A paper describes a structure:
The export apparatus consists of an export gate complex formed by 5 highly conserved transmembrane proteins (FlhA, FlhB, FliP, FliQ, and FliR) and a cytoplasmic ATPase complex consisting of FliH, FliI, and FliJ. FliP is a 25-kDa transmembrane protein that has a cleavable N-terminal signal peptide, 4 transmembrane (TM) helices, and a relatively large periplasmic domain (FliPP) between TM-2 and TM-3. Here we report that FliP forms a homohexameric ring with a diameter of 10 nm. In summary, we have presented direct evidence that FliP forms a homohexamer with the help of the FliO complex and that FliPP–FliPP and FliPP–FliO interactions are required for efficient FliP6 ring formation.
Although no St-FliPP crystal was obtained, the Tm-FliPP crystals were grown, and its structure was solved at 2.4 Å resolution. There are 2 tetramers in the asymmetric unit, and their structures are essentially identical. The 8 Tm-FliPP molecules in the asymmetric unit show no significant structural difference (root mean square distances for Cα atoms are less than 0.46 Å for the 8 molecules). The N-terminal 13 residues are invisible in the electron density map presumably because of their conformational flexibility. Therefore, the atomic model of Tm-FliPP contains residues from Thr-122 to Lys-188. Since each subunit of the Tm-FliPP tetramer is related by D2 symmetry, we studied 3 possible intermolecular interactions: between Mol A and Mol B (Mol C and Mol D), between Mol A and Mol C (Mol B and Mol D), and between Mol A and Mol D (Mol B and Mol C). The A–C interaction contains both hydrophilic and hydrophobic nature, and Met-127, Arg-130, Val-131, Arg-134, Phe-138, Glu-142, Glu-182, Val-185, Ala-186, and Phe-187 are responsible (S7B, S7F). There is no direct contact between Mol A and Mol D. Since sedimentation equilibrium analytical ultracentrifugation measurements have revealed that Tm-FliPP forms a homotetramer in solution, we conclude that the tetramer structure observed in the crystal appears to be equivalent to that in solution.
Author numbering:
A (entry chain C), B (entry chain D), C (entry chain A), D (entry chain B): 122 to 188
Amino acid sequence: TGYQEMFQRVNTRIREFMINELKNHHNEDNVFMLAKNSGIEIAKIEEAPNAVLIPAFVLGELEVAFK
Amino acid sequence: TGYQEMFQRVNTRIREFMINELKNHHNEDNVFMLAKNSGIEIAKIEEAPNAVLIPAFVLGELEVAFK
Amino acid sequence: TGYQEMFQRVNTRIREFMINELKNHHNEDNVFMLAKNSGIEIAKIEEAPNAVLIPAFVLGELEVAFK
Amino acid sequence: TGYQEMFQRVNTRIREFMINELKNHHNEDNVFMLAKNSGIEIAKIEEAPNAVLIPAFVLGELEVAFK
């Protein structure tokens, strides 16, 4: 239970900094591109689940790293 | 969509070494415990979705790290 | 050894977002504190080695995560 | 100070499961290859500093993942 709460806040923190990185580097299209090829319907990238958000973020970091 | 299948193969690899780490240090109970608390019904840890598998793996590693 | 330039790019990217996270959440003191205890003399957090920077970053994320 | 201890144990745990992954998938040559290309001299992969151990581990996982 307490574990479920602690991990919830850890998860929330990770989601926020991933969302922050995607915005600051204008890579939000990665989220939509990946969402479009999975069936998820989102208005904001905040509505993206981890299965979409995390790959988007990693691609984003790679694109910035190798520019 | 090639990115999807690439991340599909990365997801599989990560699940495999998490599961491997959990067995080798006999921490499978972490998975079941977390599965039960979240209303998930599994007979073996390979059936656990990442939302319980990943926290269980993390608990496992800290348990070993601070034993 | 092209792998090494490539990993150097990824190292730089990771340093940059760790540093950005630390500044944007006003957690730079973590770096200086960890530096002082390790006999490392730095004037700014961009000079902290990863052995200092990474633990400060993680400490920083947990502090923000748990309020 | 308690941090220097806790992060030491985390570090040790992480080095151990990386070394275990490299051995179980017979990817030790990744470590020697990268170490030789950095002017470092090791007999065991256990003597590899994180700066060669970590990217060697990552290459190893990718090779297994995409094999």
